[PDB]
Amino acid sequence: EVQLVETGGGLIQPGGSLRLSCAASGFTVSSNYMSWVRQAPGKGLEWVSVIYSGGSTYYADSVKGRFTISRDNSKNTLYLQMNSLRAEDTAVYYCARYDGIYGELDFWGQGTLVTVSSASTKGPSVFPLAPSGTAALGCLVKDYFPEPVTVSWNSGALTSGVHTFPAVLQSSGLYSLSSVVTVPSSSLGTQTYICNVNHKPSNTKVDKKVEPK
Amino acid sequence: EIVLTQSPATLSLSPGERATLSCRASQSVSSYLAWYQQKPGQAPRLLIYDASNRATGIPARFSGSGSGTDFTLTISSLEPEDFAVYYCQQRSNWPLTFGQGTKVEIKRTVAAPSVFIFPPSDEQLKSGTASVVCLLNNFYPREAKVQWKVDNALQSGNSQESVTEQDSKDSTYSLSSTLTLSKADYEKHKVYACEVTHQGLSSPVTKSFNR
């Protein structure tokens, strides 16, 4: 069972550097051709760097001279060390296995978002969306930078029938979002509904109980 | 170094229909061409390698074919969960090039929205800002007109909407319109109306509340 975990993603200043880790399972990094693939928000997939079995390294002309792809044979972890970062480098980064002949990129990391901006981190406000046969209730995650926020309900228990909307960029320069979840009206009295908003960039982790008004 | 020209850019088809996706190369790539499926907010998922060969785990409905410059991905009978973007890619000469993708939408039957309205919270009123959120829930098609009226007066340039990605189960969209106004503006007026026009409605629906 191949599993590719990724770490390192987040907010960096333009001009800055950032390292990403891709811990492997089920195969050997050293002998395989490995790749970094990135995807800018709302755009297609761009290949970044390949590292051959023989140690040869090839890069896209965009990252050439700034990025180093390197393998740690012993740890099984794989790395992408980035330098001279620009807004154009903002993207979700993917580690994936490249086949030399004509084969496959069979497995993929879950991906890790990298935001290149000089704007300071801001934690969100979490306001309740008050429910008043069927009840709609949610939480409003307002004024935060940058993305993402992870909105769950009841510590990942209430996963069914949830709509957490894609975030809009307000003129202010801060993102805002709402997360709704339709529930049986009979369970208003018994079952309490709490949204859990986690925002790693500001280390914010708000729990908010939503009750009918 | 060879650019790929995927076609069409978007495909909208109903469950049970055959879907045909094309990838055209400016320069031969013989048979070196791959196919991936990407859903909203997820890693890509390989489908086909070497133009014609289905990758491990990939269900029967997906298939590939072609050699030279013209290539083809087919989904024999579409499923509600096939809502995704689909990528072609070549690995003959350097640098490796991906295609721009084909967006596939699932074309279900007309579903009218359920409309809710949400007065700004007491917590929020302390800050001096007032968000009024209107919700259009589980509707199809995507096209929906939302109108804000405050004391029967049209609002303009103080609203932002976002739409969820298609529901992989019933293929419907939901829509969130947030009206943003000052604490003081919210208390000078009384009635907060959200009017919705949709194909699924025989007439526009207005949801409203008193402050």
- What's the number of domains chain B is made of? 2
In this structure, the answer to whether residues B93 and B137 fall within a common structural domain is no
Check whether residue B7 and residue B59 sit in a common domain. Answer: yes
- Return the structure tokens found at A109: 């990391």
Peptide bond into A166 cis (omega under 30): no
Chain A CA closest to residue B43: A110
Instruction: Suggest the residue from A172, A177, A180, A211 to mutate for an interface test with chain B (most B CBs closer than 10 A).
Output: A180
- Residue A128 shares a structural domain with residue A95: no
What does each C-alpha distance from A110 to A27, A37, B38, B198 come to in angstroms?
A: 17, 12, 12, 37
Closest-CA residue of B relative to A103 is: B49
**Cβ-based contacts of A168 with chain B (< 8 Å):** 160-162, 178
Q: Which chain B residue is nearest to residue A181, measuring alpha carbons?
A: B137
Q: How far is the alpha carbon of B91 from chain A, nearest alpha carbon, in Å? A: 7
Strand, coil or helix: A186: helix
Q: Where are the beta strands (DSSP E) in chain A?
A: 5-7, 11-12, 18-23, 33-39, 46-51, 57-59, 67-71, 77-82, 91-98, 112-116, 125-129, 134-144, 150-153, 162-164, 168-169, 175-184, 193-199, 204-210
Note the resolution in Å, 1 decimal. Answer: 2.3
Instruction: Give the 3-state secondary structure of residue B184.
Output: helix
Nearest residue in A to B34, CA atom: A104
CATH number at residue B91: 2.60.40.10
A105 touches chain B (CB under 8 A): yes
Q: Which residues of A40-67 are buried (b: 16+ CB within 10 A; e: fewer)?
A: eeeeebbbbbbbeeeeeebbbeebeeeb
Q: Are residues A4 and A61 in the same domain?
A: yes
d(CA A45, CA B98): 7
Q: Which domain holds residue B9?
A: 1-108
User: Do residues A179 and A203 both lie within one domain?
Assistant: yes
The answer on B64 and B86 residing in a single domain is yes
Rounded CA-CA distance A91/B206 in Å is: 40
Indicate if A123 and A192 belong to the same structural domain: yes
The alpha-carbon gap from A81 to the nearest alpha carbon of chain B, in Å, equals 20
What amino acid is encoded at B38 in this protein? Answer: Q
Indicate whether B168 and B92 sit together in one domain. no
> What is the maximum alpha-carbon separation in chain A?
65
Q: A107 and A9 share a domain?
A: yes
Distances (CA, A) of A160 to A137, A153, A194: 13, 10, 14
Based on the fold, state whether residues A100 and A147 are members of the same structural domain.
Answer: no
Bridge partners of B11, per DSSP, are: B104
* DSSP string for residues in B33-98: EEEEEE-TTS--EEEEETTTEEPTT--TTEEEEEETTEEEEEESS--GGG-EEEEEEE-SSSSPEE
- Is the minimum CB–CB distance between A44 and chain B shorter than 8 Å? yes
Same domain, yes or no, for B22 and B98?
yes
Token pair for B150: 């405050």
Residue A124 near residue A204 (C-beta atoms within 8 A): yes
Q: Same domain for A88 and A170?
A: no
Rounded CA gap, B6 and B97, in Å? 12
User: What's the domain range around A103?
Assistant: 1-118
- Quote the minimal CA–CA distance from A140 to chain B in Å: 9
Which one of A73, A98, A118 terminates a domain?
A118
| In a shared domain, residues B49 and B119 | no
Rounded to an integer, what is the distance from CA B159 to the centroid of its chain?
20
How determined? X-ray
Other residues' Cβ atoms within 10 Å of the Cβ of residue B173: 21
Minimal Cα–Cα distance from A35 to chain B, Å?
11
Same domain, B155 and B81: no
| Closest chain B residue to A182, measured at CA | B137
Choose from B116, B132, B207 for mutation: most chain A CBs within 10 A. Answer: B116
Is A22 in CB contact (< 8 Å) with chain B? no
For residue B130, which residues of chain A lie inside 8 Å, CB to CB?
none
Question: Domain ends where: B108, B141, B156?
Answer: B108
Amino acid at B39: K
* CA distance linking residue A115 with residue A131, whole number of Å: 35
Query: In terms of domains, do B96 and B193 share one?
Result: no
Contact B135 A108 (CB under 8 A): no
CATH code of the domain containing A101? 2.60.40.10
Give chain A positions within 8 Å (CB) of B176: 165, 178, 180
Those residues whose C-beta lies under 8 Å from the C-beta of residue A143, and which sit 6 or more positions away, are A122, A124, A125, A170, A172, A174, A175, A176
The answer on B207 and B137 residing in a single domain is yes
Q: Does A135 lie in the same domain as A92?
A: no
Max CA distance (Å), chain B: 70
The total of structural domains in chain A comes to 2
d(CA B39, CA B47) in angstroms, rounded, equals 13
CB of A99 within 8 Å of any CB in chain B? Answer: yes
